[PDB]
């Protein structure tokens, strides 16, 4: 009966390809793997082959993800109920996959006819190649191997492409799902959990396959999100539902972060590197020719203080003969113009030679070197008036901190938006779920960035005019200030306090929308409320008792029963039942005469929901404000609708996407309830804003009654304060950029260029100028640029070369055309590798054009005509810090960049040089290096955010093995 | 049509299509789909831009009922007029309610 | 059986099995323990479905 499948991932095993299905460092069994395993079981039951068995899957539900270990095997048991057409895949007795599987009795080829695209594709020549597609997917968290890299070509929108057929159904349908999720605006690891239907007809799949000039069979795939289908070959996946699986915090990327700082302490051959034509390189090769007399090689640069021969020496030491030549730099890096300027023809050179140090740098009278120190692990805390509460590590209440908000670095002023100082912010159930990790941030409607914190849905405080207001926000309510439309604000009455009013908006808006707008509750209607002692429960009780409705409330303890009795004296002893059990249903049906309750405001889950459905009377209204059964697609027997029953799915969040007159109805209802005294503030347990973590855990334990409120600011005694400015508090520094400023990324069309541009967009950048020599070539670049442009960002792709001073001037002018230049990023790079022997001065010139001369010109033009510049960042390499074989010119250019940044920072202007190691998932090293793994790009962006708020001139980020 | 609404009528014949077109000139060629198969769903999902319909007056059953449910937009109203699926207690996936959908028996 | 308290849930009877005067009716009971479900069939035709 139960077909056993011992999935083994060994090399000799036939299922070794499953090793290539990696999702965030874990080998997961694909959902299409379950589809194929059930297909095999059904073919065996019917005595057919999979290639001869057109099959239909329906209501496929994935209940857990199977971990395929590196060593060992996993047994999956498939059981078929042929009479009910159902199947069941289980692992070690635990249900894994459920659904209906049945042979397609009448396979219709017309089903696998690709739907017409909603709009024609204009960028037909520019498509996403296989490498680009899977680099993007790896950025999203799918570390797919070659076996599952079946997408050879895909359109920019992700609505069409071609899938490579390797005679493997698992890989084919997995790449089908990859194509479906490729054009997904949501970011993160999205794994399928439900599929409505999957029709596989191998007969027409063979016909649909066609072969390219590579002699590889491919199938055209079309993803129609309008129809919510994916059609490829003879596979049709309709109603695919994917949920965002959180990425495990057990990431091996624990980067080493360091600071690069100046630290005071035969026949000699002098090599002057001060020449700008690099003609000395050949002479340096001559120095490498000798062996005995080459021991005292003194490589000195005395003209330019930003020579940057540090990386040159560090890399040349790694090359053969460098240690024997003892190549050591004598760099006169005087940060200030008023400097001693030690003469290298005096006794100072003799003392330096006697010391025989590996490096000698003269810094304002200090004879030292450049050294790496461990960066302090303490996050940079700054005093700001605009901060929000965020969980630094998801699912950990201990890592709850105040971090700087986007409002302080970017102050917006426009009609229809109001910046309100927050004195009190009420923690909600969704906030606890977000902080504890039980709720995915992507589940909340709205365009939220990856680094966005959505804690807080409710606040009270003072608006810009100083009026005492209380507001309902989609997210970010746990902030010292919020930016919300005035349509979501209510005036706090004089008799109320800000602490009292902080509990009203979310709870009473939810109750009013459920009961009046949706439930249409009439006076005198018997009504059941689940979790009556809770906020929404209490508001529903107040609204129902305002209408004189008989109320049955479910509570979880005797203390909550007593509190509800005291708070609402209209409730008798027969109005209370148990919410932790199902018995409430009997109670209700005993006290309503078996008729039922006209309305059921239900926030309970699983069978407690179904019992609440059983409590419904004829013409009953079931308002489901809970989410567990809604998110799980749990079955609901529709025979209840034989009672003329209405079933409302009440979500208040849908009011933050349109905010039309439908929300204005709820706003008017809440205002009328406030005026009439129906809306009464709940009991508030107040925790000081300096300690939000204890509030979070206290409300998580669930013994709280009413509302839990964090006091961001104590309410001063007054009616309308003219100032109403938030008080200064210490918060973790976070990099944000004004929307009115333009930012330049040199080489922003490159890999790290595009990723940093996206990160800046997520940090509030609205004006971007990415400069590249060749313009837009690859499909990935075009897709990213057009996505940012559709997002509303002013992205300019310029061809101005920062190598030439005129080019840098034109680039800065183009940026200033968009807006004042707030930041310049130097990521432009050309690589001319090779040992010192097979190295030419022209290669040095080419490698230093973007980095050395480019940073010269950027610094000069920013000094001349960028008074308001906030960021001057350049990307150097750890090859400068320590040394790389065959990359002497790269190290020299990086060291020159670092010297430029150090001089800029010493003078007072912004300056930052980031010594990046191997860069993962994106870059040049992807299109173990020097003992360092490629740092994943998310970690790179986190480290860059850390570095951008540091006072150190040069910092390095690299991951050891 | 009195309320000036966009209407998608599912009929199972071409003669029914012609009679509906003659009776209600406000209906266009895109207003008609097929009631004898699930296909109408796609038709609706094509002509609503994937948004779906605000109200479903469903008298069909089984897979046609499920397809009609899948046609609901956000804040959609599903008015069950038929009784087969109601009488048989057929399970209804409780995830359409995540679109602020109200189900009317 | 007498040592096993049991719970049936959502039991549905799709058709009635007529026991012949002479002969025998074969009833197939299949259990999905992980799904906690059961199925009773007569000749491959679904007769009873539910959870147990
Ligand atoms: N659909 C929508 O738009 C909205 C939905 N909601 C949902 O409505 C539900 C109720 O809202 P709300 O009253 O504010 O939630 P609350 O924390 O205020 O209380 C909800 C009830 O959940 C019960 N509960 C049981 N165990 C726990 C626990 N471990 N932690 C916390 N509570 C527990 C408690 O009641 P008891 O012990 O007596 O059973 C608690 O009173 C929430 O789940 C919330 O997510 C809220 C706002 C809007
Ligand atoms: N990726 C990595 O592993 C590491 C990267 N870094 C730093 O990361 C930064 C980004 O490099 P990378 O990740 O490799 O991205 P890419 O190397 O893929 O992109 C390099 C970009 O440099 C552009 N470029 C070079 N010179 C100029 C110029 N004079 N004007 C305009 N554009 C220019 C090139 O433009 P065009 O399109 O015309 O070629 C190219 O697009 C570099 O500064 C690099 O030093 C540091 C250490 C490691
Ligand atoms: N719940 C309630 O309150 C009420 C419900 N109803 C329900 O409305 C539904 C339809 O009622 P109503 O529209 O008046 O019926 P009609 O006789 O006027 O036609 C019903 C439609 O159903 C289709 N149909 C499918 N099979 C048949 C069949 N064997 N004979 C005739 N027509 C068929 C036809 O459309 P097509 O063939 O093109 O598919 C037909 O046009 C019924 O299920 C009925 O139970 C009616 C009154 C009240």
Residue numbers in the entry:
A (entry chain E): 858 to 1122, 1410 to 2071, 2079 to 2112
B (entry chain F): 1689 to 1793
C (entry chain F): 907 to 958
Sentences from the study reporting this entry:
In humans, the FASN gene encodes a 273 kDa polypeptide that comprises the catalytic domains necessary for palmitate synthesis, which further homodimerizes into a pseudo-symmetric complex. The contact point of the condensing and modifying regions is the neck region, a flexible linker composed of two short unstructured loops which allow for continuous swinging and swiveling motions of the two regions relative to each other, maximizing ACP accessibility to all catalytic centers. hFASN is a validated anti-cancer target and is over-expressed in solid tumors including those from breast, prostate, liver, and lung tissues.
CryoEM analysis of the modifying region revealed an arch shaped homodimer composed of two of each of the DH, ΨME, ΨKR, ER, and KR domains while lacking density for the C-terminal ACP & TE domains. Many residues within the ΨME and ΨKR domains lacked defined side chain densities, although backbone density was clearly defined. This observation suggested the presence of significant conformational dynamics within the two pseudo domains at the periphery of the hFASN core modifying region.
